[model samples]
Target: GSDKIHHHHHHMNIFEAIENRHSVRDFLERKMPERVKDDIENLLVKFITKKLDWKINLSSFPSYIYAKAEKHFDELVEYGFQGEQIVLFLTAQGFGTCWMARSPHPDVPYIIVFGYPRTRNFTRKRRPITSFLENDLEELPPEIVKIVEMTILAPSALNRQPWKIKYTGGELCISSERPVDLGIALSHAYLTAREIFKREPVIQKRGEDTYCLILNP
Candidate 1:
């Protein structure tokens, strides 16, 4: 009498995942299936470009994913960028996630605690896009505004929402002292730009703490 059905592929698109994802503080007391764990590990390998330390502990009731990299600013940014992709993927897979600053391992800077969610209908409150902009533009494109709106939904440490945006000369620049938060926001913006414009967005490093997402590209 099996009534449950599992779909092999995720049904939700990137935009849906971005809108639906939220921090889950209460996770159900259940372990993820082996196949789901395999999918997560595969994504981790695909996204990891550097030799960063990572661990996935699914043996317990509530699973934990750990990521550790060098303390450099760029490294932290990369970690957040790569990690958020996996987070969005998990959201599409119907799992809950919370970015936890407390790590069991001292070397690891962050841990993502995940499992089946105890409840749905989580709500998110974010700062308005105007707060993050460097200046007001007379003729701002609607697509750019939509992209930044999606970006503001990304989770940050203590809900800091620290990224700054500057759009000038046909470029969207995102910057923050908190590089991890910057990277998270950038990922959202990039995905939104790709979806709305139906093309790959070009990302260029403008400085140590700033990146430009080129929509025209």
Candidate 2:
């Protein structure tokens, strides 16, 4: 008799979290338990005080993006990225979440609805990864295309998929009108890049609403 190999696949990483997460509008009619709420608050505090290296010049940012960033406009993409982490963490905690502007506090710019989902799994119809590209390339290298796939998977309001990518020279440029969605997409993009390249992608703001992944610079 041949020996059998055993494998235990029972862990969720950031990528898996992103893939599994979806907009869940209907939730169980109950508030979060005290312990779970405490855990979520602790994670939020961790992100709020964290010093992220990413930077943006909001004063120089386009008026449109400024409007989208809302009251905490100057916090830049870092704020949204932090919030997105909470979304992923909540999903990992077996909670369903949806990004929305409505919150208990009317002043809050970004918030997510969270609870036990009414359904066990959530699904939506998303555009093909190819449809989100801006460049005129039909055949792309597998690694590069993988980055695009990750970006498109980032959550957007109402499942709009409002992101476009431009591959110039040897680098990538990500653009979006929705500031929060842009931040979330950048997080996904960089995560996928690191998985493929074994290094953190160096992202820089090159224009009012354009971010360049510095592949060579």
Candidate 3:
């Protein structure tokens, strides 16, 4: 029956996973483990209900701007948040993952191919912190700077790294000229902040396609 589930679980820190996380294109030919699938399902059920209270009101924007937000807002930020969380979970379980653009299955909008990797270590190029955040380095906290550093590691189309982050006082605003990949970057920031502060920060979405991540620490 689908009613019962069990597994030997360990308490893992999200930041550790973030630091070591990487995209795996090569995979060993085999099926995913049953225990892993069960744990993934458990994570979804456990967190979604706990996190559903957060608000993102885009109705304030006009139709032209509203439609733009609609395209990538939910798909990138919300669903990307969900997808990347599970992707990191799979990584923690020692499984390889790669985000696929197209899949044979229609139901699967985004496909993550999971299996054992041929090799676990490889390097990818990324721009410096200055490239993403156009601001003074001394004003921001060391922890917030570190969070944006990790955001560089997030997945992007052709490694574009389209997201840019700005900070003023306690609020960190993320803006992207192209909103498509901002969600993935925003998720990374959210998880990184949670790791640093030991709690979720308040996020307020602005009308001009910018997301404000209110830092609590």
Candidate 4:
């Protein structure tokens, strides 16, 4: 009998993925492997709720993930949160991804295009972490500062990067007029907090469009 060998690629952890992820507009003419597609589909199923409808298309190059939900503010926020989780996962898997504002179906408000990149060199520029914070960066703990750094890296429509964060009373509150954009930023903060603290933060709904992540709670 011949001995079996196991082969697998090393996947990046959430922290490394957050550091390396960037929007890729150019893609190579290659199809995503079926196993990878199944992995992504499994992740989507975990994130999808009864409030949202979503589909994945991996048969074509630069494949798409479409999300349709009620046009309410909270629904859009949930769409952003769920979709961004997959974006980071794809980054970990060494795939390039871009968030598209347009959709093939009118009802789907979210579309993410992902594929193998034409080039391995990718760069992104974001505003300083202080720009998004109401409190001074130096005043916050080192862990909090690191979480804010990751949150600002999240992609936003028109590159607006519209989130505003405040650390007060032992809570990190994220706020924005753009619900979806806020959710994207929040997802980053949430993931980073989990990585650093080795536990999930207590997320609290503060208002119509603001949420607070309590690390100590």
Candidate 5:
């Protein structure tokens, strides 16, 4: 008897939480219903695709993602999807949430989105945005183009739309009024571009920073 493997494909859920994400502060204690979970699952069904022979499947982590990170997880990296994004997905799925930050429990690095999880640790903190900006690129690399699309939708201070980029000699730079917003936005842009362009960007604090943002590529 010989063992054989079969292959499947879809749009790849690379950014499901982000695509369906929204700003959700308050939420219901109730758990996500099976139907709603199905809804999200259904939507996530379209996140797969094959580009240049690389296959991406975002749903492969569905249950694990929600179960392990839904109500309990870190807001920054993996195994814990506790950012505004993952939390917002929980909200849409009918879970209660509170934006959290450093507080009574400084040791804990993230916030639980459920009012009544299996257990409850009632501590809360909220991070605020201070600025936003937008830049027009005359001719951006394919990678930069993709990053800019997501940057435009990133949550900004007062929805100020703070963050701008321009192609100078093929390089992109961060341009904004506040250093924090610009820096953070640059990080996101960097993340997106790095993976797509396999390149690093020059960052300048403050939109008008005269630092070097020109590209050599």
Candidate 6:
């Protein structure tokens, strides 16, 4: 489940929130009411700053709202996130993300984002990280997937699971095109992934989004 890492260099993506919101549903034709949009934005901010108690200096770019009177298309054409610590930033925002059985969403971004939606009934589910090091629930062979699986379980605004994880050699990389609540959610994923390693998380080094996780074997 866990393996030691010589160096970590993975990144987590959490930019273009509103665009990400619309990407999940192209049929979403409510013009994106300003209030609801504001609610969504504020929720993201609250989740990260308040809930996680993470000292993060957030900086957002310009976002545009388009609607005839109350309903129109909102294109968050601006806003960019560039930080050192990717997952840490997202976790501070609150909630985790999941990438499971995926549906071919119409939107391009939606299609690009999200691997597998959780709804897809898999034949077997991965055991909880605790089952490995803590209680030894089921004595299984040396597993190598605890970190990435937990990262995919991250939560989203409207159950839009947008995340992907791939292992390259001994380095496990976490990547996602998911937007909205990136800063905080990513942290939760990182913590969840790192949990398998059982290491004390210290906000010492500025982490990059596409960072690496050394498995504890």
lDDT of 5: 0.38
Worst 10 residues of 4 by lDDT: 44-53
- Stretches of candidate 1 off by over 4 Å are 1-10, 44-54
Return the number of clashes found in candidate 6. 51
Mark the 10 consecutive residues where model 2 has the least summed lDDT. Answer: 58-67
Q: What is the Cα-based TM-score of model 4? A: 0.90
Better of 4 and 5 by lDDT: 4
Q: Which stretches of candidate 4 lie over 4 Å from their true place?
A: 1-5, 44-51
CA error at residue 177 for candidate 5, angstroms: 1.8
Q: How big is the RMSD of model 4?
A: 2.7
lDDT of 6 by residue, 142-161 (tens): 34354434443434435444
Summarize candidate 4's per-residue lDDT along 95-133 as a digit string, tens digits: 888989888788787689998888988678888877889
Error of 6 at 9 (Å): 38
TM-score of each: 0.88, 0.71, 0.77, 0.90, 0.42, 0.30
Residue-wise C-alpha lDDT for candidate 2, range 4-50, written one tens digit per residue = 58555456876677787887777764544456655655663122224
lDDT string for model 3 (164-212, tens) is 7898878778887545466667777878887788877776777766777
Model 4: colliding residue pairs: none
Model 4 lDDT on a 0 to 1 scale: 0.81
Give the per-residue Cα lDDT of candidate 5 at 17: 26
Candidate 6: RMSD over Cα atoms?
A: 16.6
RMSD for each of the candidates: 2.7, 9.7, 9.0, 2.7, 12.6, 16.6
Q: Name the candidate that leads on lDDT.
A: 4
Q: Predictions ranked by TM-score, top down?
A: 4, 1, 3, 2, 5, 6
Best by TM-score: 4
For candidate 1, which ten residues in a row score worst on lDDT?
44-53
RMSD of 3: 9.0
